[PDB]
C-alpha cells in the first residue's frame with residue numbers, strides 16, 4: 768500500500784479528513800487508481816467504523832443509476848449489508864431537490880442514504 772494508506776486483509780484504504788460531495792469524492796478516489804470503499808464483510812465493516820469514528824462518511828455505494836451498486840461491480844444483493852433501521856429511505860424532505868442516492872456510514876457505523884451533493888468525508892480502497 769502507498770504511504771498514508773492503511774492495509775487490511777489484502778486491501779488498502781485512505782481516510783479523508785475533509786468533505787466533498789460524493790461525485791467529487793468518487794472522482795478523487797478514481798484519480799488515485801482506487802475506488803470509494805466497498806464493504807463485503809462484518810470484519811471489513813468493523814475495520815472501517817474504527818477509523819472514521821462517529822462521522823458521516825461516504826462509501827462506494829449509490830443508486831444514482833437505479834439499483835444499488837458498489838462502484839467496483841461487486842454484487843449488492845448477494846453481498847454484506849449494514850443499513851440503519853428504516854434505511855435506505857430515499858428521503859425528499861430535505862428540500863434540496865431529489866431523493867437520496869449516496870450511501871454513507873452514519874455516526875454509529877450503520878449506513879444511511881443521503882443527498883449526494885452534501886459534503887462528507889470519504890474513504891478510498893484498492894485491492895492487492
Ligand SMILES: [Ca+2]
Pocket residue numbers: 778804805806807811892
Ligand atoms: Ca472491500
Ligand SMILES: [Ca+2]
Pocket residue numbers: 830831857866867868869880
Ligand atoms: Ca435513491
Ligand SMILES: [Ca+2]
Pocket residue numbers: 854855856857858867879880881
Ligand atoms: Ca436516508
Ligand SMILES: [Cl-]
Pocket residue numbers: 885886
Ligand atoms: Cl450539508
